[PDB]
Structure 1
Amino acid sequence: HWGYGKHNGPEHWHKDFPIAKGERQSPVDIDTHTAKYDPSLKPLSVSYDQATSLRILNNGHAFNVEFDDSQDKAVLKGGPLDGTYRLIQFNFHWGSLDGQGSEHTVDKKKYAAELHLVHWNTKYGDFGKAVQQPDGLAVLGIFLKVGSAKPGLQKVVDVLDSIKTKGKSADFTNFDPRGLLPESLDYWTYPGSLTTPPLLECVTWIVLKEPISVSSEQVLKFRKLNFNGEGEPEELMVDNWRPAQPLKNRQIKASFK
């Protein structure tokens, strides 16, 4: 099975998933001086006031907070998107040290972690069908830097103990994702893919310019999770990020100048 270790890491993925060497793979390095300001990009419209979180789960490669996506409760629209996209989950990627952890990079700078808010295009009916389309998913990427604590993130941090190993899940209702957003919604956008197998090229990436800060104690909790299942030898869940891939003739557009 794939993972992030020496023998099953990102550099090995292409053997089981040849699309790993595709034309629109993610993540990528965002060269701020090469990105084109596009005055036709509309502002992002995030409506998370009716969001219904349900469960938090350690899937062996990261932890996900799942949302009820049976209706238009929490949606994303506007920006470079056409149509309505429903929030299905959010997850993180982090490092073993504060100087690495993010998937995307800005002018080669790596952040301590990267939060992904995953949404699927409703015109396709369900998530499974959406992942098979060029414009099936829209993922909002938010960088995390170490500094002051993020209050809205604490509820997530506190429950990590109960989902330490692979396969564990816990009820996680009434969590408000709005507490994880930065002040500004300025962003960069480019066509890309999922950053973990099956690595499908079905994502419109919307990466926020402004990072949010979390405390050292907060990220330390992420690092206590395990890749392994219960009763197995302990392997700390750290550095679950894929390195930047070649841009290959894609243009990164910016909503700001």
Structure 2
Amino acid sequence: KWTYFGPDGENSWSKKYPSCGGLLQSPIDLHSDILQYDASLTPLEFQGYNLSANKQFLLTNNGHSVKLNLPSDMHIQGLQSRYSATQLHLHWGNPNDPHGSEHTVSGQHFAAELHIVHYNSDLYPDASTASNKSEGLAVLAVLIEMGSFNPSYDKIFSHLQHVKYKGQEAFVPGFNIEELLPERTAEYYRYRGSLTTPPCNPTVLWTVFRNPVQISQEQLLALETALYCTHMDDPSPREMINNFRQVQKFDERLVYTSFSQ
């Protein structure tokens, strides 16, 4: 029953989910004082991201976000283990305040954020097993700005009126997930953190790409208005808006960058 607003909102998550009050929490504000270049942060390789358009992938409203399941033959390499994709999802604001990224850059929110969740498939047989192990998860984050219409993101957003309510599922034809990534993916921020939702496990290696992508105001409005956190038959409906966590204290961490300027 955790939420982003009211008595079950984020200042209360730790009452039920102790790690949400623990160390290494995400998201964070990316600002100069805590950035340090690291020349070892070489480019990731995106393997099997080009999903067949003749296949289909499950889109689910889970009550907290909209997620797309991804196949385990999709991987990132370049890490010291190979990590396999498990799902992607988004975080966003609301129609009257389209400023719902989780990470901030120099104190500013972007309109939204995409997360592509992977797990260490060298070591673990599924993401649920990996999720409570050190470096078990690797999440890629793409900052999203209001801008031009994005046909690639629309391959997801065009299905939103079919997963309006919690528990609903739809199919999305495959497409090349690398189309959701920004330019110059070799340029990224890297840090050790956590899930940004309960149970807040501090088991995530985060990669936030330096450059944002754009989606239109109309795409953001669809994202911000189509979805509910509640079931179709709930007599107390709740709009799925503002589903981002506030940024967290650093706890002495630095953020490492693959770019020096």
Q: Does TM-score exceed 0.5, indicating one fold? A: yes
1:59 to 2:57 alignment: no
User: Offset of 1:98 from its aligned partner?
Assistant: 4.6
Aligned to 1:92: 90
Which residue in 1 is equivalent to 2:178?
178
Aligned match of 1:216? 217
* Pick aligned residue for 2:250 from 239, 247, 250: 247
Matches within 5 A, 1:41-56: 41-51=41-51, 54-56=57-59
**Contact 1:99/1:110, CA 8 A, preserved across alignment:** no
1:56-82 CA distance string (max 9 Å, x none): 00000000000122xxx211121xx21
Q: How many residues align?
A: 252
Please report how far the alpha carbon of residue 234 of structure 1 lies from its aligned counterpart in structure 2 after TM superposition. Answer: 3.0
Q: Counterparts in 2 of 1:1-257, with a 5 A limit? A: 1-51=1-51, 54-69=57-72, 73-78=73-78, 81-96=79-94, 97-122=96-121, 123-185=123-185, 186-224=187-225, 225-232=227-234, 233-257=236-260
C-alpha contact (below 8 Å) 1:29/1:104 kept by paired residues: yes
What are structure 2's unaligned runs of at least 5 residues?
A: none
TM-score, length-scaled by structure 1:
0.94
Deviates more, 1:45-54 or 1:1-10: 45-54
1:190 is displaced (CA, Å) by 0.5
Q: TM-score, normalised by structure 2?
A: 0.93
- Is the 2:230–2:238 contact (alpha carbons within 8 Å) kept by the matching residues of 1? yes
**Cα offset for 1:139?**
0.2
State the Cα RMSD in Å.
1.4
Offset at 1:51?
A: 3.5
8 Å Cα contact 2:46/2:178 also seen in 1: no
Distance 1:118 1:49, change over 3 A: closer
- Structure 1 gap ranges (5+): none
Deviation at 1:125, TM superposition (A): 2.0
8 Å contact from structure 1 (residues 226, 234) kept in 2: yes
